Amino acid sequence: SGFRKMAFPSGKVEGCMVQVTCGTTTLNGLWLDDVVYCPRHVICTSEDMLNPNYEDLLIRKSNHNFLVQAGNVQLRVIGHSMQNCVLKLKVDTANPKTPKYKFVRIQPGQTFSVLACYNGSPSGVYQCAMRPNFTIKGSFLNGSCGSVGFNIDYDCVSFCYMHHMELPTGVHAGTDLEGNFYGPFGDRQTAQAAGTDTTITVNVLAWLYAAVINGDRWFLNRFTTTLNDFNLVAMKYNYEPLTQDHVDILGPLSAQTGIAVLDMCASLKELLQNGMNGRTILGSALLEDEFTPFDVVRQCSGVTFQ
Amino acid sequence: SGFRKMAFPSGKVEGCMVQVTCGTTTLNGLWLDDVVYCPRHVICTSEDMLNPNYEDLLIRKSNHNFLVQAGNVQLRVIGHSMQNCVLKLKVDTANPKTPKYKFVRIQPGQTFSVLACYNGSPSGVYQCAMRPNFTIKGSFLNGSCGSVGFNIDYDCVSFCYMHHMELPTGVHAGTDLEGNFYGPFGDRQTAQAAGTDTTITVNVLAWLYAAVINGDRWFLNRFTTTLNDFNLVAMKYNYEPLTQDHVDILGPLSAQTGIAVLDMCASLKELLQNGMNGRTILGSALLEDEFTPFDVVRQCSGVTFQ
């Protein structure tokens, strides 16, 4: 029993982190086979960040301008190119610790673990969700860019995020590993703001199921609702619409507990309309939306990674 | 910016996890040099758990009765002994992945990361605190015993917890790596209950400082208090006493922010007496007590591990 915001084991990703320095600037890179992936703004000076011409700044860099270190060990750069907002530095040594891996572009609502790093070394690991406004609520400081977000499925690490920047309110934005930003953001120090966020309804329902599984059942009521009528309430409280696909994805937890998804929807409707009146669910005073259905099942069934 | 419940990178500990099977029962072990540490109740059958005589059950086991596997690879057991509530299985192969490590007995109030494991494989990592009642609020299922809790300082893993059992309310109990339980518990399926818990006052203050550092300052008031008068309020709300040592330990965060510890105490006093009136601090609707002063500084300054 118990339910925690649980991150993936980070060892496979730790073996891939390196330091990338270009002149003054040092940030993190990801070393897979003989390629190091890092944010392209490593090539910028504190002078011009308001709007760099990255393509131009890069023509004036050569391989030797990039100091890549894996721990103590320098890795010689033997080629370089830019793909959208990331640099790919070909090095003379393939990482012997390269896990089985894929690059994925996650969808808003999905979760992943961030391995926060500085100077190529890990500081810590935590779980996040890609928010509907394409930000993540992370914890990042100067020097953290190039830190990555990932999922693990058995033996395969799916890299889905690389960290690039921090928006007003202290939320964070970044790219997939092909260097394409999530959301309408770019890597320039200009006036950018996240869109209004929304609550990930299907994840809240998944967490309510997690609560029932753990014995925290006080919020279950006797009623049901239709999908359409539920979504009218969701909208008012800035919850995203629940689709039939969401309902189907909740099927395993619904089956395990015997609580139809629409019955759980009626219980969530009442929580939105009436609040929690000082009670908690799974120790929380607010409704939690950063556990997917798969996260709940993984944690409550003990899924492990090879 | 941002502030997250952050766990230590788990790679050093992952390389140490193994599966230990004795007859039916399989749980996790920790493989350091040529010794595997695991909970002694691996030698029990589902028949007698209400009160095993472990010393007796062990005399009838020989080395070959223990199947130890590190991934696919069997490790031959060449000796065995019991130390309090853990078994030490000497094996014929030293773990080549053994990190620099120590065994520590943590104090209530301190935090550590748990690497939850099943069948010798990691499921996930999360941060916990040793509660004043010597429990942790973890997430554990059948088969998770032998999962360990740890801190990292530079290159050194301090192992402080091994998981043994779950108490009513869904809280968890275990031992240090010398097999001595934290708290008044034992490894027998009998009526055991945690004592009444209390809130870790010094950690709440540390988190309030973390909030100020992140710009969330609405709860700061203009007043101060004495240590003695603050502790009278703390007591009423089931907060542990704040000592001068606690004040001194908060010195770095007090210096960084310019807010005297006793000024922050006056602000916490007001939160306890008046509540938060629907506001949040660092995204939370409740006061958080599972960040130590060192955790806050580590996260807000980017401390990394070699």
Ligand SMILES: *C(=N)[C@H](C[C@@H]1CCNC1=O)NC(=O)[C@@H]1[C@@H]2[C@H](CN1C(=O)[C@@H](NC(=O)C(F)(F)F)C(C)(C)C)C2(C)C
């Ligand atoms: C990479 N190491 C840092 C990570 C930032 C730094 C503080 N916390 C973070 O997550 N990334 C940057 O410094 C990027 C970088 C230029 C400036 N920048 C920002 O994150 C800035 N934000 C924005 O410009 C805004 F508001 F548009 F998001 C800053 C104001 C410094 C936080 C480039 C190339 C975007």
Ligand SMILES: *C(=N)[C@H](C[C@@H]1CCNC1=O)NC(=O)[C@@H]1[C@@H]2[C@H](CN1C(=O)[C@@H](NC(=O)C(F)(F)F)C(C)(C)C)C2(C)C
């Ligand atoms: C080790 N793999 C499990 C972990 C438990 C199992 C469910 N969630 C956990 O953390 N440990 C046990 O099964 C231990 C073991 C006997 C029974 N046990 C318990 O945790 C039981 N608890 C107690 O007896 C109580 F209440 F005293 F804490 C159980 C009721 C099965 C949860 C021994 C040797 C303690």
